[PDB]
């Protein structure tokens, strides 16, 4: 009975960061401040543990007591498919409180537990494809900060810096409300043009613009991009409208990648394939409810001969990318000229995603998700 | 470097069995005789091993030297996705000699190696869904043996015996060439009717008839089955004709399950979904080239809200079934009144798929594929 789960614990602590998020949830650099972060730990009878990080609200007591403990406590931690399906089955009746985000953090902690228990990196447990992978530099949403990301030329200048660092691909997130004047298709296209001019024709370029443009605006945006040789256009319209995506992909030459944010996990992504709503699939550990369903989406895409690009940084997504073939990149970011991504986080002793000078991220040879957790730091900065 | 593969070995030995196969490859009971069986072993630097069984021609020296050793030797055994993809990439150019069957046995040996090395059953490594699963009794193709499977009533009588044993579902394979008079739709339907009459309405019944009936014959067969409340009709036409399956499923009420034998692995099975060629998907470790692609097919089906029924017995298929939710059964057989399935194989010390009196197969709690291999027997019966 050593593999039986005995405890599920949440520890909330303060991390020091210059990352802020606006009222619409878009990241920006700002003053150094303390932000509450949560760590979920699952422990078995023999004392082995697995951990994963998320925002405090996602693993608050209501959700832990009503849902997570009831599924996990007393169960064999290795039964990840059974445990995931049990949580999935309870979402419909949860009064909207048991979210895909909660499933993701629980599933990730279970994977970390298995890996740490076995002394194996998660991607090796899954079945490894690659130990290193090209990353694109994923640039934060636009701002109104002088010298930051306020003008089209600001994007161009930051792009030059990213190429020097070794990134072989660059993705722009452009300007979005509550930036006062946003959104503006002409401004987005000017940023795209400035970046292409700055880096030349051989760096791969992507755009993830305002996520709710009308069909007419997204068509104008996509048309403007075809002149610049961009690799993909990402979520330019409300992803709840599958029909809009069928229409847009039919009317654009540039590949459309999606859905990133849409609900329904791997099931809904099958619908995007069936309906021809995208040219490249998208998934992400946080978006589909864990490593387990992310892997399902990767396999789904592969069976159709499609790529499936993995949204988001951190170990959980990196291990999905390392375990699969049909994904061009790891998404490294979000990045901003004012911030030093390579410095990492105060609660981790080293980076989960170190990148060489040629633009390859190397998966750490550490067990589980391989997050090098500074438990002492967390203990010293607990939220009472 | 303890995880690095150092050796790939094939040991051919004689097993004593009453299973024969006719000229078309269909199994039948006959005289006790000795049949050559091959065991593939993969070994790492630290001396850990994994094993899998297949027919000698599938792992003959030509294939081992030209393909398998070149991919595996010197590589990290845990990189199953990379190694599978490397073998897949070499099939096209192999002058038809590197088959999906060869990929399957190699992939299975790699999974067994990881499980044995970690002390974990393969389904627990994948992420377990169930430790036991309902099995259907899968009846051998028809014969002309008196009291065997020669008449419709013979099927009825054997069905009664299987229900007593505890099977909750039963699948008929009916009469096929070179049975002198075969095939005959009317005879197949008589067997189906005899079985339904024998077992009543609450036992689940399936039919896997002659695999190459015309559209007109398969329509007549399927129409006759709807009167008997059968759960599915399996491969009644040449599976190379996707279009025939679209047509047949459109014209039958009874669910069509497939494709079992078609080439193209998980990719081709996506096409069956996209085209609406079946109501229930089919896969199998031997049919799609290993546990790795079988899992991909399971996930593909699940994303469409479909079941995917796993073809074939033995540990390799049982572990796929135990790791996934969207499959109703393990296929236990093939069975015949003249043969005692529960006696197992002379080269295994116990059954990979023991079944209780309620019709549940219990996955052995043994590492890797959990095949309880009698190495001494194999050594004593080697083919010189
Ligand atoms: Cl709460
Ligand atoms: Cl940076
Ligand atoms: Cl770095
Ligand atoms: Cl520490
Ligand atoms: Cl040979
Ligand atoms: Cl039997
Ligand atoms: Cl048994
Ligand atoms: Cl032995
Ligand atoms: Mg995005
Ligand atoms: Mg298009
Ligand atoms: Mg740090
Ligand atoms: Mg069959
Ligand atoms: Mg139908
Ligand atoms: Mg035996
Ligand atoms: Na977007
Ligand atoms: Na399209
Ligand atoms: Na058939
Ligand atoms: Na159909």
XYZ file of C-alpha atoms in Angstrom, chain B residues 31-227:
197
model
C -3.160 -32.706 -33.719
C -0.685 -31.805 -30.993
C 2.458 -30.634 -32.776
C 5.543 -28.500 -32.257
C 5.468 -24.950 -33.606
C 8.454 -22.604 -33.757
C 8.033 -19.482 -31.613
C 10.425 -16.540 -31.315
C 11.329 -14.416 -28.305
C 12.908 -11.000 -28.835
C 15.076 -9.713 -25.965
C 16.452 -6.189 -25.576
C 19.209 -5.686 -22.985
C 20.805 -2.557 -21.519
C 24.300 -1.821 -20.123
C 23.202 -2.603 -16.566
C 21.945 -6.008 -17.647
C 18.210 -5.288 -17.443
C 16.097 -7.022 -20.084
C 12.730 -6.810 -21.769
C 11.108 -9.512 -23.876
C 8.277 -10.056 -26.325
C 7.010 -12.998 -28.398
C 6.244 -13.277 -32.129
C 6.528 -15.608 -35.125
C 10.114 -16.401 -36.216
C 9.838 -14.810 -39.702
C 8.946 -11.447 -38.135
C 12.261 -11.222 -36.246
C 14.470 -13.252 -38.614
C 18.136 -12.222 -39.042
C 17.522 -10.152 -42.204
C 15.193 -7.847 -40.286
C 17.206 -7.773 -37.066
C 20.506 -6.935 -38.751
C 19.278 -4.550 -41.438
C 16.752 -2.610 -39.355
C 16.295 -3.362 -35.658
C 19.897 -3.331 -34.378
C 20.719 -0.214 -36.401
C 17.941 1.733 -34.692
C 18.249 0.349 -31.149
C 21.892 -0.425 -30.326
C 23.561 2.405 -28.393
C 20.310 4.253 -27.694
C 18.487 5.133 -24.462
C 15.761 2.478 -24.182
C 13.318 4.976 -22.685
C 13.165 7.009 -25.913
C 10.329 4.835 -27.236
C 8.754 7.586 -29.324
C 12.051 8.411 -31.054
C 12.878 4.756 -31.622
C 9.408 3.922 -32.948
C 9.483 6.877 -35.323
C 12.952 5.833 -36.533
C 11.651 2.354 -37.406
C 8.489 3.775 -38.998
C 10.605 6.055 -41.200
C 12.519 3.042 -42.566
C 9.480 0.980 -43.562
C 8.817 2.671 -46.892
C 12.312 1.873 -48.148
C 12.524 -1.659 -46.714
C 11.442 -3.579 -49.840
C 8.333 -4.572 -47.834
C 10.401 -6.426 -45.227
C 10.121 -4.081 -42.221
C 6.513 -4.740 -41.278
C 4.110 -3.379 -38.682
C 4.491 -6.777 -37.018
C 8.223 -6.157 -36.581
C 7.562 -2.705 -35.148
C 5.040 -4.210 -32.713
C 7.374 -6.781 -31.209
C 10.218 -4.276 -30.824
C 7.959 -1.666 -29.210
C 6.522 -4.301 -26.854
C 9.994 -5.455 -25.806
C 10.930 -1.835 -25.102
C 7.848 -1.366 -22.932
C 8.574 -4.629 -21.086
C 12.157 -3.471 -20.544
C 11.054 -0.172 -19.004
C 8.514 -1.918 -16.782
C 10.885 -4.647 -15.638
C 13.622 -2.062 -15.010
C 11.275 0.067 -12.869
C 9.415 -2.818 -11.225
C 6.104 -1.576 -12.666
C 3.343 -3.186 -14.733
C 3.168 -1.502 -18.134
C -0.414 -0.258 -17.678
C 0.547 1.432 -14.404
C 3.480 3.147 -16.158
C 1.170 4.411 -18.874
C -1.329 5.562 -16.262
C -3.865 3.000 -15.108
C -7.604 3.103 -15.744
C -8.766 -0.339 -14.558
C -7.154 -3.381 -12.902
C -9.790 -5.735 -14.270
C -11.896 -5.709 -17.419
C -14.768 -7.652 -18.944
C -13.672 -10.123 -21.601
C -15.664 -11.574 -24.456
C -15.144 -15.169 -25.509
C -13.843 -14.966 -29.060
C -14.744 -18.163 -30.938
C -12.445 -19.596 -33.636
C -13.420 -19.610 -37.307
C -15.791 -22.366 -38.351
C -14.577 -25.813 -39.314
C -15.866 -29.155 -40.596
C -15.031 -31.058 -37.392
C -17.920 -33.109 -36.025
C -18.997 -31.613 -32.690
C -16.565 -28.728 -33.136
C -17.781 -25.709 -35.086
C -19.244 -27.532 -38.093
C -22.935 -26.612 -37.786
C -25.008 -23.687 -36.539
C -26.051 -25.772 -33.525
C -22.373 -26.409 -32.672
C -21.945 -22.674 -32.159
C -25.062 -22.622 -29.993
C -23.755 -25.407 -27.779
C -20.311 -23.864 -27.392
C -21.960 -20.544 -26.526
C -23.819 -22.207 -23.643
C -20.486 -23.475 -22.284
C -18.912 -20.005 -22.527
C -21.819 -18.405 -20.637
C -21.408 -20.992 -17.874
C -17.685 -20.127 -17.688
C -18.702 -16.531 -17.025
C -18.248 -14.669 -20.308
C -20.708 -11.767 -20.537
C -20.078 -11.358 -24.265
C -19.418 -13.805 -27.108
C -18.054 -13.162 -30.606
C -18.487 -15.642 -33.459
C -15.954 -16.016 -36.223
C -17.938 -17.952 -38.843
C -16.975 -20.192 -41.787
C -14.283 -19.142 -44.268
C -12.357 -20.753 -47.151
C -10.759 -23.238 -47.323
C -13.832 -24.739 -45.591
C -15.181 -26.479 -48.690
C -18.580 -24.779 -48.964
C -17.625 -21.396 -47.476
C -18.558 -18.607 -47.322
C -22.345 -18.659 -47.065
C -24.316 -15.747 -45.583
C -27.279 -17.981 -44.787
C -25.085 -20.348 -42.763
C -23.461 -17.458 -40.881
C -26.897 -16.087 -39.977
C -28.034 -19.534 -38.841
C -25.050 -19.726 -36.484
C -25.854 -16.267 -35.139
C -29.490 -17.230 -34.583
C -28.572 -20.489 -32.856
C -26.292 -18.622 -30.457
C -28.894 -15.967 -29.629
C -31.492 -18.685 -29.029
C -29.067 -20.564 -26.770
C -27.933 -17.680 -24.538
C -30.990 -15.418 -24.450
C -31.270 -11.623 -24.883
C -28.898 -10.404 -22.111
C -25.591 -11.870 -23.287
C -23.824 -9.490 -25.711
C -23.166 -11.006 -29.144
C -20.778 -10.046 -31.957
C -19.959 -11.469 -35.406
C -16.675 -11.345 -37.329
C -17.635 -13.032 -40.604
C -15.737 -13.827 -43.833
C -13.517 -10.753 -44.303
C -14.119 -10.198 -48.029
C -17.877 -10.421 -48.722
C -19.254 -8.223 -51.494
C -21.306 -5.154 -50.561
C -24.500 -7.052 -51.449
C -23.598 -10.051 -49.251
C -22.502 -7.911 -46.296
C -25.748 -5.941 -46.513
C -27.695 -9.219 -46.434
C -25.639 -10.400 -43.474
C -26.036 -7.154 -41.531
C -29.760 -6.993 -42.228
C -30.185 -10.495 -40.849
C -28.335 -9.550 -37.656
C -30.555 -6.629 -36.747
C -33.308 -9.164 -36.059
